[PDB]
Amino acid sequence: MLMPRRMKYRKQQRGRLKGATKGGDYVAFGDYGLVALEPAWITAQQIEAARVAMVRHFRRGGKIFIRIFPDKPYTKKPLEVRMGKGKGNVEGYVAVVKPGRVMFEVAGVTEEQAMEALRIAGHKLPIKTKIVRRDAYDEAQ
Amino acid sequence: XXXXXXXXXXXXXXXXXXXXXXXXXXXXXXXXXXXXXXXXXXXXXXXXXXXXXXXXXXXXXXXXXXXXXXXXXXXXXXXXXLXXXXXXXXXXXXXXXXXXXXXXXXXXXXXXXXXXXXXXXXXXXXXXXX
């Protein structure tokens, strides 16, 4: 999958999901990008499932830029166990994405391709998405 | 009207040497007969007697922006203008007169011509060959 190589703490509280995006709202790298429209924990297996979908659509071509990173520990208690006895074990890792974050984005591929490519990856994600392309993203001078 | 602008501009410039500007019939041909008709007074008149077709609309505006109305007898419908800036006007016609009678079409298909300014006629085309 995709996950941190080291850590200071193996497990962490759940935290909340209010707010916009904090950052990562403009294209920055490629020509097109997939933006999140709802709050959600995107799991490593979801990210992978999307990325492969990408590389799979446009076989041998362009560059894909995964911009979200699963570094937050997802926990789960053993099958059929009661409440108590301490915190559960790490089942996987997630990426906390809030409305507006540009999760993925492609480069070096025909427009038509960028579309169907990003559309598919959307389906793999557990939230509503929107495709876009460089615009007022030139945050400069 | 951005591409049609160049179209008319070109028709006019070409409509300059008005010596054999004629318009007749023998249509409904294939693409194989394309290079055919396009060989009449081109193998005796050279790059002087050619056959170019364009929008009737844009064509009827050309004749206005440079006197040559009277094309009322012949105007409506799908038409072609066998422009001949050089090479015998009556000779470049003695061609379009045969190929037509050859491609299987009665001696009835000639919609007037303008020889160096002069409204020809219908039957006045069956003679421009003989």
Partner: protein, 184 residues
């Protein structure tokens, strides 16, 4: 590129937009006024104007002063403009972003790879009067390996730069085909 502006006294910015306008501001050494522009109209300009070309504003005083966007703040969600910063041009030397027009088919593409345009601009200081349009760039020749950058561009008359200039501006990276899964 003509874009009209209007003055703002000091009434709820939330209203301006809940209307159809886009609040903003004008400034440089001297002068700094709260202004605004029609949203749907400012967008049509910026789409091409961007921050690479000078946006000539106006006002009631019929004073068409030249400027260029210093920064546009977005809405994060809804992702649309929410405020603009207009920099009024003078005669003084100013630093701006001039678009890099990478022209040519890099040998690395036909071969194997994608032209990742690391930097589609480059802040450079210059004279308002003398503002370039686009700094062309020689891309052909770049193979799969590393790629040209920063200190490798034809800097027009009176236009140096505020870069490293080691800052890589482009690089050809091999393409991604098949064969995946490394964690067996």
């Amino acid at each position: 590129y003509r874009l009209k502006a209007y003055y703002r006294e000091g009434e709820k910015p939330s209203a301006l937009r809940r209307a159809g306008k886009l609040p903003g501001v004008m400034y440089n050494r001297h002068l700094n006024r709260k202004v605004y522009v029609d949203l749907v109209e400012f967008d049509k300009v910026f789409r091409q104007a961007s921050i690479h070309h000078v946006i000539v504003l106006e006002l009631p005083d019929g004073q068409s002063l030249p400027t260029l966007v210093r920064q546009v703040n977005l809405d994060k969600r809804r992702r649309r403009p929410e405020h603009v910063d207009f920099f009024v041009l003078s005669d003084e030397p100013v630093e701006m972003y001039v678009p890099l027009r990478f022209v040519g088919t890099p040998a690395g593409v036909r071969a194997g790879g994608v032209l990742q345009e690391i930097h589609r601009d480059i802040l450079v200081k210059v004279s308002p009067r003398n503002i370039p349009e686009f700094i062309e760039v020689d891309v052909s020749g770049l193979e799969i390996g590393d790629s040209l950058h920063a200190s490798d561009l034809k800097l027009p008359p009176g236009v140096e730069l505020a870069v490293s200039p080691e800052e890589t501006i482009a690089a050809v990276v091999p393409p991604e085909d098949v064969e995946k899964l490394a964690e067996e």
